[PDB]
């Protein structure tokens, strides 16, 4: 990326974290107010691959 | 995933070859069967639910499988089983449209054998559920499409056993 | 292909192919026979297209075949036409499938990084592709020449 | 604890009676109760024991009654109805092609009442009706379900 | 996880058995000890920190373990160790309330032996930390509950060795 | 490997300590249960074959596992499976004599989970085969030895899951 | 390994199915091409050495590969390379007789990609050596057998890339 | 098969098939339709062969269906004939393959260990297997009955 | 160290070190010999420093060494000075590293939980550290005494 | 990770030792080479792109690797490869500044050998790409720093082989 | 131990333990209480046994504490008694287990190579052990003194 404001922009670690968090999928299931939880066996349809 | 056509393109791309006569003949062999694949998919899709019901009736229910101690005992597990059946039917319809089984490996078979071993899901009984849906499908789609639909059900079932 | 861009899309929502969605799977099938034919025609004249593209290129941009040019010399020029042969091949692939798909994975994603390393001037590669459009297009009927032309202009677009 | 086990005893002890009362009450044209392999609204438009059902259709219909009863005893020991709503939540559709849904409710209605005669309604007579109410409630509507 | 009431149901469900007399007797044997389990949990919870402190004092600290070269040397590792201790105490309290050790397997023991081998965490020393907390617990909870609390500490400790 | 006694000796050797009161108490706790361990081993050894037979009958055969598509289909694989069963029984008998599970790690569990994943061997089904042999063993060996035999079967089974 | 006749049996055995109409049709599709496979194998075997010689001449030698710094420089490595070539030719002839590529996976491809990476053996150059032998083979065996021989050379070459 | 057994010899010596190896594949495949007919006839009469085999077996050795017998009872008997059904199936496989590879991996390697565990009396089982030969052989022409008979006698041989 | 801290920030942003980061490594390393001298002096007087901190502590808090005090008695006092010896050691480490990474992982992260368990009054441990600052600082030149003092005040800060 | 200085601190911390003469001598041996490490890093960083281009030119491209069938064929994979190269260069520069290879293990080598085996990435070819960048680096940084930069490139390359 | 030895022989044969080796264990269990007691007794007088062993040794072999002797000097003698303390400890371990086992791995396998390097005269180490037997044996009842004596004579044997 580069450093933009105070910095830590498109980081390595920093970029990865925004990318996750700003994803479509993230803000759908847990969008906005909920803390993330394991979507394991009981909760959703699990992939078998 | 890949279909008939991209199977050929990627096989030539790795050699960096323009498509030659042998390639062009393969692609023709796909295009020439294409209209029939479409008609067959429309029959399967629109009879989806009836195919599952007739396949379950011939190969799963009225049995120890649906009784206490059986893996499709409980409304929960009965629902999971016919849910699975719908996956198989639906994906086999994709494979047959694509004219390539690669999607059945990527999105259905990978890890499924062990997943079923881990839950206790009876493999042999599931294969019969696949080969019963094939039987029904082959009646509904007719001479034109019977053999072509059938193979991807057979792909599915030798993928588990 | 058109198919790939398509069976995978009606599987992200867990459903069967939509009745309108089996119609793009219809135009392409009719188109494919014509599409296959155009690719074969392009394949037949490949050596002529590349060579005449290469002359058209070096007139328009003589700097790449000059002292401080990426393609300066006989074997720096040989590799340059080979790259032009690569892209014409990918253009035949794109036409036949009906969707660009495989060409992207084969020759544009990563192309900036590859050529920046080699220090190849990207925009003059885009010119080499325009030059191939001009030659290839003169060996095709009006209707087929346009259909081919979209794929040439895509590659020109992606190197940008 | 101690009640529930006693309350569940009673239901188990004379389980068949509760079932026979239902079995007899919807199946007219023979003895439904001979079939059950232990012995080994509108609502009725009474199925016949050999004419509309057959033997094999009948056995499924008889087992369910017994099986339906069994689940409440399991359900009773645990805190709730979870083992009853979950297995009955979409039961309507699996059953309807060959079972009259509304006919089946009357056996369930009957059982709840017939289950209660056993209790002296201290609190445990209320209970048995409460668990069996779930099967009926959650079954009908048939839009809400599944 | 499962508890005594739940285990009786799943153990019978797999056989498709109504609860019968033998089942009903087991469940009574749980219910009849239930009030005592609750009182014992309230003592453990409210003395949690003191139990860890007295258990560490008898079985861990004032030793080579807390000295340079020892696994509970550094404030980091001392903190991790008494953190662990709190897990054990807390889960044993769950197991004892449930009257079933299954939670100790599912959420505590599974993989823990090898996790400790991989980090170098001394197993024998950890067992003594478990059996010291048991000793303290058995004093605090009294005649009523002593034997019942004790067994799930013993379950934990033979799970590591 | 190590047993109860060498577990203590090596724990003190690394500290260069002569055996003290705490050590001597541990060793007594082993010696005092020793005669009972021996009697239990003689029952298991002499009923070995019957324990496997009854454990397979309750937890493996009469099932999809033994049918085509199942992992214990073919005389080859049926033989391999009950061969395995004999290993488990035999080693658990060693662990229980030694009063230490270390041999179950060194010579049985190490790599076994992945070995089974690689061959397709159903893990959950194997655990049931272990916990069925435990059930039989606990009847045959009696009050004296039941709890002590049982733990090393439980060690084995949480080692796979 | 498996062949078309054998694969049909094991694919059905895992489902516990008698051979049925679909199975019987597959086996016929093999038997009906059988005589042609045999004739083709006799041509390849008896021209083995000439096929390697012509394939090397079109795709390997007269190049940097055979010059100092090249992987088939030294009589040692030149010998190893055409030794390999003979393996490929010979096994492809087995696969084509069997009408199944499974032997090419079991006894040729497994680990070979990494073996070549570890020695430095040029993969792309080896593929050209495979596709040149195919070219020669397809001339020698004629219309009858050309497509059928060809596929197992193509199996080999997409197995490396 | 003959193919599996033989090709294996080819690959192991790093070579194409011999004239001999090619000849036997040719003679073998010529004998295909007949072998398929032999399997069909026996598949078509499987229930009869098993049942009549089972009577012939229990006369020649009944004790197995008696108080202290391995096959005593209705469901301990439902398993002994089922095993006889298994072996007839494997015999049909062997006949169409022209050797035992399949018969062997599926039902003789490990069979001593399996049956010793079950304490089914194995040697009684050989006699039971022998009875099936007698029944099956009475539904086949002289020539086909012999060809079938080799595979029955193999299983009888392997047991013991 | 200063090195570890600079690098970790570099790697985490996927980049080479900044001019700033490079400058501080340079200034830091120039102070190497001086920092090593500061650690030596304090290592050389460790036994004296611990005792004078310990006297300063027990005057200011005679209670800790009183009936209901955490450090009451001869061996509850012996362990208390040993802890004071521990922290002086960590302070010498910090001074030679030029930051707290080592000081932190070894003796502040988890220190609240450790001492709360032992029921040690944390703020009187902070006093014991101030007492050591006072003694250690009287054995160092003005400039070196300040440089040392930052690390003492850090520990005092972290126990808070 | 650790550097020269924290390597020493942690080695003494586990013994609970104040730094002694031997320790102080080691740290001096680092500080005394420190200014030179910084200058070398500024040369590498500012010539990063040219080092990769000259290293690829001597050891990777103009070859079968970049041709169809080769692992750095396709703009995608060519980009991935020189991306990797930049990692190596950048991390080696970290290791050399730190005067400790531990970061090369923690953040680069761990699992990388098998990752490359799993994708098919040619190991020997990657090592040559590392040892070519070293060659270029050693020219650019000069007498002062050549040996010190070089070792962490050599650490990287014996970490893969 | 006796347990380890019995089991290892059992497992090597891959068959459950016998009668004849499921006995010795019973004897050992009864013996172990007595064995544990002897080790405790030996442990109590360790300092006296070592010191008096050390006097008995240097009278019998004054050459090791002489100009060209391995144990010449106050330390070189201090380390020598420490080694005598090591072996007495291992002897208590051996007695308690009932089998020598761990002592071998701890202090005889490799002992020739260790002491040859240090240039220690092995046979005078064997004498130091005899000297310890004499002292230890005078603090034990006749029966317990013999049982202990076997383990002393083993070590004496292994240094040979
Ligand atoms: C404990 C919660 C629970 C229930 C009740 C349950 C029922 C259940 N009923 C079934 C079928 C059936 N059930 C019935 C009949 C009836 N069912 C009734 O509850 C009525 C008394 C009667 C109609 C009047 C019939 C006729 C079938 C055959 C399916 C078909 O229509 O083909 C099946 C399919 C397998 C089978 O044939 O047994 C299930 C899984 N599953 C569960 O987990
Ligand atoms: C998109 C591709 C895809 C497939 C195919 C798939 C299968 C699949 N089947 C599952 C369970 C199951 N599958 C079945 C299937 C059956 N029961 C029987 O007795 C019959 C033999 C059989 C039906 C014919 C049952 C009963 C379960 C539930 C097991 C349980 O109770 O946990 C699960 C576990 C998670 C869940 O319960 O949903 C998966 C992932 N998942 C996927 O993502
Ligand atoms: C290097 C990181 C590190 C530190 C600092 C550390 C401290 C530490 N201090 C301890 C005890 C102690 N520490 C103190 C200290 C004090 N009493 C007071 O009132 C004063 C406030 C304070 C002296 C300034 C006392 C009195 C004990 C004994 C407490 C007990 O035994 O209950 C113990 C338990 C005894 C032992 O096993 O060593 C540890 C581990 N351990 C570590 O790994
Ligand atoms: C919820 C169930 C659960 C448990 C029980 C659990 C244990 C556990 N203990 C750990 C480490 C540890 N465990 C200890 C424990 C001890 N040190 C000693 O010397 C004593 C013998 C012993 C305390 C009595 C120590 C010191 C570490 C740190 C090891 C390290 O430095 O990496 C870790 C590694 C991750 C971490 O450091 O937090 C886990 C996961 N994790 C879980 O999720
Ligand atoms: C001394 C300690 C030790 C153990 C425990 C051990 C286990 C082990 N089990 C194996 C295979 C196997 N293990 C089983 C086991 C089972 N099949 C089932 O369906 C059941 C769930 C289960 C029996 C309860 C089977 C069927 C195979 C054969 C897999 C194959 O066909 O390759 C193999 C592969 C080599 C072989 O086939 O013999 C090993 C090494 N090996 C050892 O050295
Ligand atoms: C350093 C180890 C080494 C050796 C020796 C070597 C020899 C070698 N000799 C060759 C050809 C040849 N070599 C000869 C040699 C002879 N013709 C005769 O009749 C005489 C007996 C003999 C000369 C004394 C001939 C005639 C050819 C051409 C054969 C052909 O093209 O078919 C070739 C193939 C052409 C090429 O690509 O270079 C190689 C590799 N390669 C090596 O790596
Ligand atoms: C296809 C390869 C193959 C074979 C052959 C096979 C046999 C086999 N026979 C079995 C039992 C049995 N088999 C028999 C057979 C006999 N009793 C007698 O006395 C006679 C000698 C003989 C009949 C001719 C009996 C009586 C049992 C029941 C034994 C028991 O339950 O203890 C069982 C255990 C029951 C089960 O789970 O299915 C298997 C797996 N399994 C296989 O995978
Ligand atoms: C199919 C996807 C694909 C492409 C396109 C590709 C291109 C490619 N072009 C290369 C070189 C080159 N390519 C060119 C091309 C040009 N010079 C100019 O100035 C013009 C702008 C342009 C011609 C139009 C030149 C001059 C070189 C040599 C550069 C060097 O050696 O430094 C190389 C390195 C040489 C080699 O090992 O092959 C690759 C891999 N590789 C691929 O996998």
Q: What would you note in describing this structure?
A:
The structure is cut from a larger assembly and holds two copies of chain A, five copies of chain B (161 residues) and four copies of chain C (160 residues). With 49 residues, chain A is mostly helical. Helix content of chain A is 27%, strand content 0%. Chain A is built from two helices and no strands. Chain A has helices spanning 13-21, 26-29. The longest helix of chain A is centred in the middle third of the chain and has 9 residues, at 13-21. Chain A is elongated. With 161 residues, chain B is mainly α. Chain B has a single domain (1-161), classed as Phycocyanins (Globin-like, Orthogonal Bundle), CATH 1.10.490. The radius of gyration of chain B is 18 Å and the shape is globular. Helix content of chain C is 72%, strand content 0%. Chain C is mainly α. Chain C has a single domain (1-160), classed as Orthogonal Bundle (Globin-like), CATH 1.10.490.20. The G-J interface holds G 113-114, 117-120, 122-125, 127-128, 160-161 and J 64-65, 67-71, 73, 117, 120-125. One phycocyanobilin is lined by residues 60, 65, 71-72, 77, 80-81, 84-85, 87, 107-108, 115, 119, 121-122, 125-126, 129 of chain F. Chain A: This is Phycobiliprotein ApcE. Chain A: Belongs to the phycobiliprotein family. Belongs to the phycobilisome linker protein family. Chain A: It is found in: Cellular thylakoid membrane.
Question: Any chance you could write out the topology, listing elements then pairs?
Answer:
The structure is cut from a larger assembly and holds 2 copies of chain A, 5 copies of chain B (161 residues) and 4 copies of chain C (160 residues).
Chain A: H1 13-21, H2 26-29
Chain B: H1 4-13, H2 21-31, H3 34-59, H4 75-98, H5 102-109, H6 112-119, H7 123-141, H8 146-160
Helix pairs in contact in B: 1-2, 3-4, 3-7, 4-5, 4-8, 5-8, 7-8
Chain C: H1 4-7, H2 21-44, H3 46-60, H4 74-97, H5 101-107, H6 111-118, H7 122-137, H8 142-158
Helix pairs in contact in C: 2-4, 3-4, 3-7, 4-5, 4-8, 7-8
Bound molecules: phycocyanobilin (CYC) (8 copies).
